[PDB]
Amino acid sequence: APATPYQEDIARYWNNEARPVNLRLGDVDGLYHHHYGIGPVDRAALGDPEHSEYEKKVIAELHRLESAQAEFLMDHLGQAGPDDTLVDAGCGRGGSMVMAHRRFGSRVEGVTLSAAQADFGNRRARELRIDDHVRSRVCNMLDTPFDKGAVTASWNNESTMYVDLHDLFSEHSRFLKVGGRYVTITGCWNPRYGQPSKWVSQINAHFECNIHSRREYLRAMADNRLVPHTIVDLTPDTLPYWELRATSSLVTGIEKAFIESYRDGSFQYVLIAADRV
Numbered sequence: 493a494p495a496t497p498y499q500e501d502i503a504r505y506w507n508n509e510a511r512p513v514n515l516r517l518g519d520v521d522g523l524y525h526h527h528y529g530i531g532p533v534d535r536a537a538l539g540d541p542e543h544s545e546y547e548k549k550v551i552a553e554l555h556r557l558e559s560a561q562a563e564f565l566m567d568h569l570g571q572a573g574p575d576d577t578l579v580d581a582g583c584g585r586g587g588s589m590v591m592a593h594r595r596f597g598s599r600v601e602g603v604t605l606s607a608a609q610a611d612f613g614n615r616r617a618r619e620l621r622i623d624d625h626v627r628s629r630v631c632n633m634l635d636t637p638f639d640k641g642a643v644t645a646s647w648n649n650e651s652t653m654y655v656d657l658h659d660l661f662s663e664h665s666r667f668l669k670v671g672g673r674y675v676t677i678t679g680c681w682n683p684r685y686g687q688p689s690k691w692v693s694q695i696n697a698h699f700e701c702n703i704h705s706r707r708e709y710l711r712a713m714a715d716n717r718l719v720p721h722t723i724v725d726l727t728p729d730t731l732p733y734w735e736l737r738a739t740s741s742l743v744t745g746i747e748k749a750f751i752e753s754y755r756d757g758s759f760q761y762v763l764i765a766a767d768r769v
């Protein structure tokens with residue numbers, strides 16, 4: 493039962509989504525991601541752009557960068573093991589959850605507003621025989637069933653732009669144990685630019701989302717017991733992914749808004765990793 497009209501819009505959006513730039517990339521190795529990539533492009537793997545198999549090599553390379561982005565996120569989760577619970581807040585089709593369970597062996601709990609996504613991820617988990625440890629549910633991430641202090645680490649990978657940040661961080665702070673760890677990778681508008689540019693607004697309109705400024709991320713963390721220990725401006729790191737993607741037949745039309753706003757300083761891609769204290 494949707495918490496607000498807006499969250500009903502978001503459930504409907506993701507229930508309806510199935511773009512090739514997501515499913516064909518996930519098909520490469522069965523890790524289905526809904527986030528962007530980081531790191532240098534492997535031009536050797538790509539080979540000659542004129543080759544018959546170029547588009548398939550581009551697909552494998554873009555997917556490799558999107559998985560690299562998740563790995564980088566998890567490098568900031570600290571240590572976790574089989575007796576711990578990890579929470580993926582706004583978990584998509586569950587590729588990050590699969591990777592986390594492989595990396596840490598923990599119980600991994602995902603929440604999403606989309607029944608089609610939860611169903612997809614739970615089917616994937618059963619296929620991989622890790623469904624006793626990895627579970628998606630349809631649940632608003634601002635109001636979860638996890639007990640106070642029960643969670644060792646948690647994250648939002650490109651899902652914070654659908655909620656009020658004070659409410660989101662109050663919720664993670666509630667369920668994270670003292671000394672637990674939080675990470676987010678997000679696109680935030682740059683308060684140095686001053687307000688959201690036209691490009692940022694085009695991205696909001698495209699995804700029905702609400703990009704926050706970097707100032708708001710840090711303010712909401714400070715107000716909710718979450719203290720950053722690492723912040724990385726990944727903007728230069730994600731541009732190669734976007735410039736490569738822009739050459740792909742699977743483009744969605746938002747590539748220019750990301751590239752141009754990254755280049756002009758109005759928009760930035762950032763990792764913030766924090767302790768719950």
Ligand SMILES: Nc1ncnc2c1ncn2[C@@H]1O[C@H](CSCC[C@H](N)C(=O)O)[C@@H](O)[C@H]1O
Nearest residue numbers: 525526582583584604605632633649651654
């Ligand atoms: N209030 C809310 N509660 C739970 N999930 C939410 C939410 N608002 C948005 N979402 C989820 O946020 C996700 C954005 S897509 C990113 C998915 C995933 N973290 C990945 O990196 O692949 C979607 O799954 C959407 O359902």
Ligand SMILES: CC(C)=CCC/C(C)=C/CSP(=O)(O)OP(=O)(O)O
Nearest residue numbers: 511513525526527650678679699701
């Ligand atoms: C501002 C940022 C970083 C993201 C905007 C919100 C959002 C849901 C982007 C979608 S990621 P995904 O569903 O994987 O999108 P596409 O590849 O189809 O463009």
Ligand SMILES: [Mg+2]
Nearest residue numbers: 513514526527
């Ligand atoms: Mg995608």
